[PDB]
From TrEMBL:
<dbReference type="GO" id="GO:0051607">
    <property type="term" value="P:defense response to virus"/>
</dbReference>
<feature type="disulfide bond">
    <location>
        <begin position="79"/>
        <end position="92"/>
    </location>
</feature>
<dbReference type="GO" id="GO:0001913">
    <property type="term" value="P:T cell mediated cytotoxicity"/>
</dbReference>
<feature type="binding site">
    <location>
        <position position="67"/>
    </location>
    <ligand>
        <name>Ca(2+) 2</name>
    </ligand>
</feature>
<feature type="binding site">
    <location>
        <position position="18"/>
    </location>
    <ligand>
        <name>Ca(2+) 3</name>
    </ligand>
</feature>
<protein>
    <submittedName>
        <fullName>C2 domain protein</fullName>
    </submittedName>
</protein>
<feature type="binding site">
    <location>
        <position position="40"/>
    </location>
    <ligand>
        <name>Ca(2+) 3</name>
    </ligand>
</feature>
<feature type="binding site">
    <location>
        <position position="74"/>
    </location>
    <ligand>
        <name>Ca(2+) 2</name>
    </ligand>
</feature>
<feature type="binding site">
    <location>
        <position position="20"/>
    </location>
    <ligand>
        <name>Ca(2+) 3</name>
    </ligand>
</feature>
<feature type="binding site">
    <location>
        <position position="69"/>
    </location>
    <ligand>
        <name>Ca(2+) 1</name>
    </ligand>
</feature>
<dbReference type="GO" id="GO:0016020">
    <property type="term" value="C:membrane"/>
</dbReference>
<feature type="binding site">
    <location>
        <position position="67"/>
    </location>
    <ligand>
        <name>Ca(2+) 1</name>
    </ligand>
</feature>
<feature type="binding site">
    <location>
        <position position="69"/>
    </location>
    <ligand>
        <name>Ca(2+) 2</name>
    </ligand>
</feature>
<keyword id="KW-0732">Signal</keyword>
<feature type="binding site">
    <location>
        <position position="68"/>
    </location>
    <ligand>
        <name>Ca(2+) 1</name>
    </ligand>
</feature>
<keyword id="KW-0106">Calcium</keyword>
<dbReference type="GO" id="GO:0046872">
    <property type="term" value="F:metal ion binding"/>
</dbReference>
Length: 108
């Protein structure tokens, strides 16, 4: 078992009333959680970090960026990546436009 730390989530260029963004985080089949909604912000960053203490190399880190609304949330983009030991900076392109940038560390 290893520790995954997902952190430094930020997006630039979210749809624009203006996007109410949040991020969903999965590690393999574990739903690690979601950020809070960063309201009325095309370029949010989140303070949230996510850790999973049962991670293993090659697990699939999946990030979804959503736009929150009253009845239905809108999926803005999905990224999938096999996690590798060490610290990594990555970009995730959102189909609907915009880029989610994030870092992760897989350790132990």
């Amino acid at each position: 078992h290893m520790q995954l730390r997902l952190y430094n989530l930020r997006v630039r260029g979210l749809p624009s009333g203006i996007t109410d963004g949040y991020v969903k985080v999965f590690c393999g089949s574990a739903n690690l959680g979601e950020t809070s909604v960063n309201h009325n912000n095309a370029n949010p960053w989140w303070t949230e970090e996510f850790s999973h203490f049962k991670a293993q190399e090659n697990d699939i880190l999946r990030l979804e960026v959503h736009d929150e609304d009253t009845f239905f949330d809108d999926l803005l983009g999905v990224c999938q990546r096999q996690i590798k030991v060490g610290t990594h900076e990555h970009d995730c392109y959102l189909k609907e436009g915009g880029t989610l940038h994030y870092m992760y560390t897989l350790s132990v």
